[PDB]
Each structure stands twice: as structure tokens, then as C-alpha cells.
Design an enzyme around this catalytic site. Structure first.
Site, PDB file in Angstrom:
ATOM      1  N   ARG A  89       0.815  -1.221   0.000  1.00 14.84           N
ATOM      2  CA  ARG A  89       0.000   0.000   0.000  1.00 14.84           C
ATOM      3  C   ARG A  89       0.849   1.273   0.000  1.00 14.84           C
ATOM      4  NH1 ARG A  89      -0.184  -2.242   4.844  1.00 14.84           N
ATOM      5  NH2 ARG A  89       1.132  -1.251   6.439  1.00 14.84           N
ATOM      6  N   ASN A  90       2.116   1.185   0.403  1.00  9.57           N
ATOM      7  CA  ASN A  90       2.996   2.350   0.467  1.00  9.57           C
ATOM      8  C   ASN A  90       3.928   2.454  -0.734  1.00  9.57           C
ATOM      9  OD1 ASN A  90       1.929   3.299   2.865  1.00  9.57           O
ATOM     10  ND2 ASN A  90       3.247   1.984   4.119  1.00  9.57           N
ATOM     11  N   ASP A 137       5.318   6.366   0.368  1.00 10.74           N
ATOM     12  CA  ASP A 137       4.837   6.856   1.659  1.00 10.74           C
ATOM     13  C   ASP A 137       5.882   6.663   2.747  1.00 10.74           C
ATOM     14  OD1 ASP A 137       3.436   6.344   4.481  1.00 10.74           O
ATOM     15  OD2 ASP A 137       2.103   7.584   3.263  1.00 10.74           O
TER      16      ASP A 137
HETATM   17  C1  LIG Z   1      -3.125   9.141 -11.746  1.00 12.14           C
HETATM   18  O1  LIG Z   1      -2.395   8.984 -10.564  1.00 12.14           O
HETATM   19  C2  LIG Z   1      -2.983   8.199  -9.575  1.00 12.14           C
HETATM   20  C3  LIG Z   1      -4.254   7.665  -9.726  1.00 12.14           C
HETATM   21  C4  LIG Z   1      -4.801   6.880  -8.701  1.00 12.14           C
HETATM   22  C5  LIG Z   1      -4.070   6.635  -7.559  1.00 12.14           C
HETATM   23  C6  LIG Z   1      -2.790   7.172  -7.393  1.00 12.14           C
HETATM   24  C7  LIG Z   1      -2.268   7.951  -8.404  1.00 12.14           C
HETATM   25  N1  LIG Z   1      -0.956   8.533  -8.283  1.00 12.14           N
HETATM   26  C8  LIG Z   1      -0.293   8.812  -7.021  1.00 12.14           C
HETATM   27  N2  LIG Z   1      -0.912   8.645  -5.857  1.00 12.14           N
HETATM   28  C9  LIG Z   1      -0.271   8.903  -4.723  1.00 12.14           C
HETATM   29  N3  LIG Z   1      -0.867   8.749  -3.409  1.00 12.14           N
HETATM   30  C10 LIG Z   1      -2.271   8.568  -3.125  1.00 12.14           C
HETATM   31  C11 LIG Z   1      -3.235   8.737  -4.090  1.00 12.14           C
HETATM   32  C12 LIG Z   1      -4.568   8.560  -3.768  1.00 12.14           C
HETATM   33  C13 LIG Z   1      -4.943   8.227  -2.487  1.00 12.14           C
HETATM   34  C14 LIG Z   1      -3.973   8.058  -1.521  1.00 12.14           C
HETATM   35  C15 LIG Z   1      -2.644   8.233  -1.832  1.00 12.14           C
HETATM   36  S1  LIG Z   1      -1.376   7.994  -0.559  1.00 12.14           S
HETATM   37  O2  LIG Z   1      -1.808   8.414   0.738  1.00 12.14           O
HETATM   38  O3  LIG Z   1      -0.229   8.814  -0.771  1.00 12.14           O
HETATM   39  C16 LIG Z   1      -0.954   6.231  -0.540  1.00 12.14           C
HETATM   40  C17 LIG Z   1      -0.409   5.820  -1.903  1.00 12.14           C
HETATM   41  C18 LIG Z   1       0.001   5.953   0.610  1.00 12.14           C
HETATM   42  C19 LIG Z   1       1.066   9.333  -4.768  1.00 12.14           C
HETATM   43  N4  LIG Z   1       1.966   9.666  -3.804  1.00 12.14           N
HETATM   44  C20 LIG Z   1       3.112  10.018  -4.370  1.00 12.14           C
HETATM   45  C21 LIG Z   1       2.976   9.921  -5.738  1.00 12.14           C
HETATM   46  C22 LIG Z   1       1.668   9.482  -5.990  1.00 12.14           C
HETATM   47  N5  LIG Z   1       0.954   9.221  -7.100  1.00 12.14           N
HETATM   48  N6  LIG Z   1      -4.879   5.799  -6.649  1.00 12.14           N
HETATM   49  C23 LIG Z   1      -4.404   4.967  -5.582  1.00 12.14           C
HETATM   50  O4  LIG Z   1      -3.259   4.885  -5.349  1.00 12.14           O
HETATM   51  C24 LIG Z   1      -5.445   4.206  -4.772  1.00 12.14           C
HETATM   52  N7  LIG Z   1      -4.953   3.777  -3.486  1.00 12.14           N
HETATM   53  C25 LIG Z   1      -4.567   4.881  -2.641  1.00 12.14           C
HETATM   54  C26 LIG Z   1      -5.956   2.957  -2.838  1.00 12.14           C
HETATM   55  C27 LIG Z   1      -6.255   5.981  -7.052  1.00 12.14           C
HETATM   56  C28 LIG Z   1      -6.138   6.167  -8.536  1.00 12.14           C
END
Ligand SMILES: COc1cc2c(cc1Nc1nc(Nc3ccccc3S(=O)(=O)C(C)C)c3[nH]ccc3n1)N(C(=O)CN(C)C)CC2
Length: 304
Positions: A156-157, A173
Site C-alpha cells: 500500500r505504500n 509513503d
Molecule cells: C493518476 O495517478 C494516480 C491515480 C490513482 C491513484 C494514485 C495515483 N498517483 C499517485 N498517488 C499517490 N498517493 C495517493 C493517491 C490517492 C490516495 C492516496 C494516496 S497515498 O496516501 O499517498 C498512498 C499511496 C500511501 C502518490 N503519492 C506520491 C505519488 C503518488 N501518485 N490511486 C491509488 O493509489 C489508490 N490507493 C490509494 C488505494 C487511485 C487512482
């Protein structure tokens, strides 16, 4: 004001790259992080693509400092398997941290969503999983050789640059490490929020953390990867896992997992930290699995 020390250098809020708020455009919401929404954004014809972490305007003094420290931590890393920090926008409200956009999303969701199925049979192969494992181990090796204990290595990270072939996996993360840095312990969290299922016995028993901590967690991440995104210790609660692991219990191989890969996991899960491999050794063993035809020719299970 607060100082952050990494690799023997001390940095402060004054060292973060403040990006003018006028240059930041939010595109869409991607969901909530540990405390605040995350957005897809742009920084300025050919703008940089960024993930934007926001700080809620309704927050405490400690949240503000948690947010600053997260920025300092990620800004001082320099490695291709750790998400880059483009800059910050701390002088306008709500405050932003700007990160390298990881268009493939988090690694756990990716594995679950990209599992081979009857509709898309060849979505993933053993070599894809080995490359993801190698990618993250390289970033863990960088943390280890700079004496930084991540404390929360888990699918998840981790994030992927893109969904399709050519994807690169990166550690994205650092919130657990940030919580520990500020107070020395899990003040922000609780027993129910600890990532029990990723921690070695000396960590949750004595609160002792070394880089052999991350070795153990990486073994669990390996299980997550080769299980295609299952929750570790499937039916077990946190306390059941705690007692199971302290009694010597270990997870079975994920379905269809090649022996050599499973054996990396079990080496990561040695009870004594001195018996666990460092990340240089883990990388060698992953590289050897990638060379082995019997490993990479193993078919992943198809999910009906
Ligand atoms: C087009 O782009 C994206 C499109 C999508 C996601 C991610 C990115 N892109 C991204 N997300 C980051 N975080 C992040 C994003 C959303 C929620 C929480 C966090 S979060 O808390 O950081 C966590 C990773 C620990 C990022 N952090 C650094 C770079 C980076 N890029 N989605 C997921 O990942 C879904 N999951 C969370 C369940 C949903 C669709």
C-alpha cells in the site's frame, strides 16, 4: 524551525523548494491520504505531472509539523525507486506537497486489479512481479545504506509510474517514519493502527528497530506481491498474527509461488535479526530468480 537530519546533513523548511501557487493546477481528486485528499496536478506547454498532497485547513499544530516533516523527509531522498518531490506550496492555504505523479497508483490496488483473469489472461507474469520486487529492494537498499529505517514497507505504500509495461515501482509513503522521527514513538497512532502484520518480533515486543526491521517487512511485501495483492496472514487478526509470529509461525507460499522466491521470504522472516539478509543479498537473490527459467516460466494463477 524544526530541523531534519538525513545522511548527516541538516535541513529545514527554508530548504524546501517553494513553488508559486499560481503555477499549480489541480486536475482531479484521487482519494484520501492519511490526513487529507490527494490530487492529480500540474506545475508550469509541457507542465510537470504531480500528485498533490494537501494539508487540511482545519488541523492542529502537530498536523502542521507532521506535514512539514513529511516534506523534509521526501525532499532529501535522491533515488530512482523513491518518489521524487517536485517542491512544496506551504505559503498559501491549503498547503501542498508536490510529488512525482505515479500514474499506475498504489501497488496493492494494482496487483488486485491487474490479476490475470479469463478476460485478460496475460495481464501479468512472474517476471513483472520480480521486477517490482527488485525495484522496491533497490530503494530499500538505498535507505539501508543511508541508515534510514522505513518501518512500514508494504504494498500500500509503494506506487507504480504507469499501469502498462515499463512500469517502475517506488516507495511513496513515509508517514510511519515521520511519526517516529517527530516523537520517537507512535504517538499519533495506536496499537490498532500499527502495521502488525509487517513487523518482526523484536519490533512489536521491544520496540527495537534496525534495517533488519525493513528486511522482515520486505519479506511480507514479497508475499503480497506474489499473492497478487492478498492481505497477509489471510484469516488472522493483528493479535493472532502477533502470537503466531512470535511462536515461530510463518505464512505459506502464495499460490503457484516458485520455491526460490518463497525461500527469499523465509530468509527475510528469520527470528533473529542477524540471520536475516541485508538488501544487497536480497537483491542478489531476486536477480538470481529472474535468471532462472523455472522461476519465470511459472504461470500465475488465473482468477475466475
Ligand atoms: C493518476 O495517478 C494516480 C491515480 C490513482 C491513484 C494514485 C495515483 N498517483 C499517485 N498517488 C499517490 N498517493 C495517493 C493517491 C490517492 C490516495 C492516496 C494516496 S497515498 O496516501 O499517498 C498512498 C499511496 C500511501 C502518490 N503519492 C506520491 C505519488 C503518488 N501518485 N490511486 C491509488 O493509489 C489508490 N490507493 C490509494 C488505494 C487511485 C487512482
Amino acid at each position: 524551525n524544526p530541523n531534519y537530519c538525513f545522511a548527516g546533513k541538516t535541513s529545514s523548511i527554508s530548504d524546501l523548494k517553494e513553488v508559486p501557487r499560481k503555477n499549480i493546477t489541480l486536475i482531479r481528486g484521487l482519494g484520501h491520504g492519511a490526513f487529507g485528499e490527494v490530487y492529480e496536478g500540474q506545475v508550469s506547454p509541457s507542465p510537470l505531472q504531480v500528485a498533490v498532497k494537501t494539508l487540511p485547513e482545519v488541523c492542529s499544530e502537530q498536523d502542521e509539523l507532521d506535514f512539514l516533516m513529511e516534506a523534509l523527509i521526501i525532499s532529501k531522498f535522491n533515488h530512482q525507486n523513491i518518489v521524487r518531490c517536485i517542491g512544496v506550496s506551504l505559503q498559501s492555504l491549503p498547503r501542498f506537497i508536490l510529488l512525482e505523479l505515479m500514474a499506475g497508483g498504489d501497488l496493492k490496488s494494482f496487483l488486485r486489479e491487474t490479476r490475470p483473469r479469463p478476460s485478460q489472461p496475460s495481464s501479468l507474469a512472474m517476471l513483472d512481479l520480480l521486477h517490482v520486487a527488485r525495484d522496491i529492494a533497490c530503494g530499500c537498499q538505498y535507505l539501508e545504506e543511508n541508515h534510514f529505517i522505513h518501518r512500514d514497507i508494504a504494498a500500500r505504500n509503494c506506487l507504480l509510474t504507469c499501469p502498462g509495461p515499463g512500469r517502475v515501482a517506488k516507495i511513496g509513503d513515509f508517514g510511519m517514519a515521520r511519526d517516529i522521527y517527530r516523537a520517537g514513538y507512535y504517538r499519533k497512532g495506536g496499537c490498532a493502527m500499527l502495521p502488525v502484520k509487517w513487523m518482526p518480533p523484536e519490533a512489536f515486543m521491544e520496540g527495537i528497530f534496525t534495517s533488519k526491521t525493513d528486511t522482515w517487512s520486505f519479506g511480507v511485501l514479497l508475499w503480497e506481491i506474489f499473492s497478487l495483492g492478498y492481505m497477509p496472514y489471510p484469516s488472522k487478526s493483528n493479535q493472532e498474527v502477533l502470537e503466531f509470529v512470535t511462536s515461530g509461525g510463518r505464512m505459506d507460499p502464495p499460490k503457484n509461488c516458485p520455491g526460490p522466491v518463497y525461500r527469499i521470504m523465509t530468509q527475510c522472516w528469520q527470528h533473529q535479526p542477524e540471520d536475516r539478509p541485508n538488501f544487497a543479498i536480497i537483491l542478489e537473490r531476486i536477480e538470481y530468480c529472474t535468471q532462472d527459467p523455472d522461476v519465470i516460466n511459472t504461470a500465475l494463477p488465473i482468477e475466475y
